[PDB]
Design a protein around this motif. Structure first.
Motif, PDB file in Angstrom:
ATOM      1  N   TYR A  93       7.452  -7.871  -3.783  1.00 49.63           N
ATOM      2  CA  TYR A  93       6.631  -6.866  -4.439  1.00 49.63           C
ATOM      3  C   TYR A  93       6.134  -7.468  -5.737  1.00 49.63           C
ATOM      4  O   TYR A  93       4.950  -7.371  -6.053  1.00 49.63           O
ATOM      5  CB  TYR A  93       7.399  -5.541  -4.692  1.00 49.63           C
ATOM      6  N   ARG A  94       7.031  -8.169  -6.486  1.00 53.87           N
ATOM      7  CA  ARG A  94       6.716  -8.792  -7.760  1.00 53.87           C
ATOM      8  C   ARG A  94       5.879 -10.047  -7.585  1.00 53.87           C
ATOM      9  O   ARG A  94       5.088 -10.399  -8.456  1.00 53.87           O
ATOM     10  CB  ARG A  94       7.951  -8.950  -8.689  1.00 53.87           C
ATOM     11  N   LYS A  95       6.028 -10.700  -6.398  1.00 51.41           N
ATOM     12  CA  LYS A  95       5.425 -11.943  -5.968  1.00 51.41           C
ATOM     13  C   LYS A  95       3.970 -11.769  -5.655  1.00 51.41           C
ATOM     14  O   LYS A  95       3.131 -12.544  -6.106  1.00 51.41           O
ATOM     15  CB  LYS A  95       6.207 -12.517  -4.767  1.00 51.41           C
ATOM     16  N   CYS A  96       3.651 -10.702  -4.886  1.00 49.43           N
ATOM     17  CA  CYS A  96       2.322 -10.321  -4.458  1.00 49.43           C
ATOM     18  C   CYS A  96       1.455  -9.937  -5.644  1.00 49.43           C
ATOM     19  O   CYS A  96       0.291 -10.316  -5.717  1.00 49.43           O
ATOM     20  CB  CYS A  96       2.341  -9.307  -3.276  1.00 49.43           C
ATOM     21  N   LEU A  97       2.066  -9.253  -6.651  1.00 45.97           N
ATOM     22  CA  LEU A  97       1.460  -8.845  -7.906  1.00 45.97           C
ATOM     23  C   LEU A  97       1.128 -10.050  -8.756  1.00 45.97           C
ATOM     24  O   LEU A  97       0.084 -10.082  -9.406  1.00 45.97           O
ATOM     25  CB  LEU A  97       2.353  -7.882  -8.723  1.00 45.97           C
ATOM     26  N   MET A 131      -2.636  -9.384  -6.602  1.00 45.17           N
ATOM     27  CA  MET A 131      -2.837  -8.211  -5.758  1.00 45.17           C
ATOM     28  C   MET A 131      -3.125  -6.989  -6.608  1.00 45.17           C
ATOM     29  O   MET A 131      -2.664  -6.887  -7.745  1.00 45.17           O
ATOM     30  CB  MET A 131      -1.648  -7.873  -4.835  1.00 45.17           C
ATOM     31  N   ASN A 132      -3.912  -6.040  -6.053  1.00 45.63           N
ATOM     32  CA  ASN A 132      -4.305  -4.835  -6.739  1.00 45.63           C
ATOM     33  C   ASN A 132      -4.884  -4.026  -5.633  1.00 45.63           C
ATOM     34  O   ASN A 132      -5.782  -4.469  -4.928  1.00 45.63           O
ATOM     35  CB  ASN A 132      -5.384  -5.020  -7.854  1.00 45.63           C
ATOM     36  N   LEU A 133      -4.401  -2.785  -5.464  1.00 46.75           N
ATOM     37  CA  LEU A 133      -4.764  -1.885  -4.386  1.00 46.75           C
ATOM     38  C   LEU A 133      -5.897  -0.986  -4.856  1.00 46.75           C
ATOM     39  O   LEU A 133      -6.102   0.142  -4.413  1.00 46.75           O
ATOM     40  CB  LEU A 133      -3.453  -1.269  -3.831  1.00 46.75           C
ATOM     41  N   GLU A 134      -6.699  -1.574  -5.770  1.00 46.59           N
ATOM     42  CA  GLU A 134      -7.905  -1.103  -6.380  1.00 46.59           C
ATOM     43  C   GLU A 134      -8.538  -2.390  -6.849  1.00 46.59           C
ATOM     44  O   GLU A 134      -8.873  -2.567  -8.020  1.00 46.59           O
ATOM     45  CB  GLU A 134      -7.727  -0.134  -7.572  1.00 46.59           C
ATOM     46  N   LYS A 187       0.810  -1.210   0.000  1.00 49.84           N
ATOM     47  CA  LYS A 187       0.000   0.000   0.000  1.00 49.84           C
ATOM     48  C   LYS A 187       0.845   1.263   0.000  1.00 49.84           C
ATOM     49  O   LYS A 187       0.411   2.304  -0.490  1.00 49.84           O
ATOM     50  CB  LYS A 187      -1.126  -0.069   1.061  1.00 49.84           C
ATOM     51  N   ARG A 188       2.100   1.161   0.505  1.00 46.53           N
ATOM     52  CA  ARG A 188       3.079   2.230   0.540  1.00 46.53           C
ATOM     53  C   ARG A 188       3.944   2.135  -0.693  1.00 46.53           C
ATOM     54  O   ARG A 188       4.297   3.149  -1.289  1.00 46.53           O
ATOM     55  CB  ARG A 188       3.978   2.138   1.799  1.00 46.53           C
ATOM     56  N   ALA A 189       4.267   0.890  -1.108  1.00 46.50           N
ATOM     57  CA  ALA A 189       5.155   0.522  -2.200  1.00 46.50           C
ATOM     58  C   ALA A 189       4.600   0.814  -3.573  1.00 46.50           C
ATOM     59  O   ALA A 189       5.349   0.938  -4.539  1.00 46.50           O
ATOM     60  CB  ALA A 189       5.530  -0.966  -2.144  1.00 46.50           C
ATOM     61  N   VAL A 190       3.254   0.913  -3.668  1.00 43.69           N
ATOM     62  CA  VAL A 190       2.505   1.133  -4.883  1.00 43.69           C
ATOM     63  C   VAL A 190       2.220   2.605  -4.972  1.00 43.69           C
ATOM     64  O   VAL A 190       2.626   3.277  -5.920  1.00 43.69           O
ATOM     65  CB  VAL A 190       1.178   0.309  -4.907  1.00 43.69           C
ATOM     66  N   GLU A 191       1.485   3.108  -3.958  1.00 38.76           N
ATOM     67  CA  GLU A 191       1.016   4.475  -3.845  1.00 38.76           C
ATOM     68  C   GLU A 191       1.965   5.238  -2.967  1.00 38.76           C
ATOM     69  O   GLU A 191       1.603   5.806  -1.936  1.00 38.76           O
ATOM     70  CB  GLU A 191      -0.438   4.569  -3.319  1.00 38.76           C
TER      71      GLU A 191
END
Ligand SMILES: [Zn+2]
Ligand SMILES: [Zn+2]
Length: 72
Positions: free
Chosen positions: A59-63, A67-70, A27-31
């Motif tokens: 970070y690449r793993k979660c994606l 994952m999507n913070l939307e 959430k910090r790493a994206v936005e």
């Protein structure tokens, strides 16, 4: 369980089952955009131990997980 750094999960957020930290991380790493980078190596496995070894892979793993913070 966290489906990124394969640890005990504390609920799903951003569409995927993740830990407490992976939520805040992402959430910090994206936005915000944090510098990690493991695009020049791409060696390390990210799990319950190796999470502290590299915050780039996770970070690449979660994606990869979906994952999507939307997310919904
Ligand atoms: Zn995690
Ligand atoms: Zn790495």
């Amino acid at each position: 369980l966290c489906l990124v750094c394969s640890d005990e999960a504390s609920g799903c957020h951003y569409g995927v089952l993740t830990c407490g930290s992976c939520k805040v991380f992402f959430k910090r790493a994206v936005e915000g955009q944090h510098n990690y980078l493991c695009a020049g190596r791409n060696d390390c496995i990210i799990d319950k131990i190796r999470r502290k070894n590299c915050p780039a892979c996770r970070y690449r793993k979660c994606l990869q997980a979906g994952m999507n913070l939307e997310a919904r």
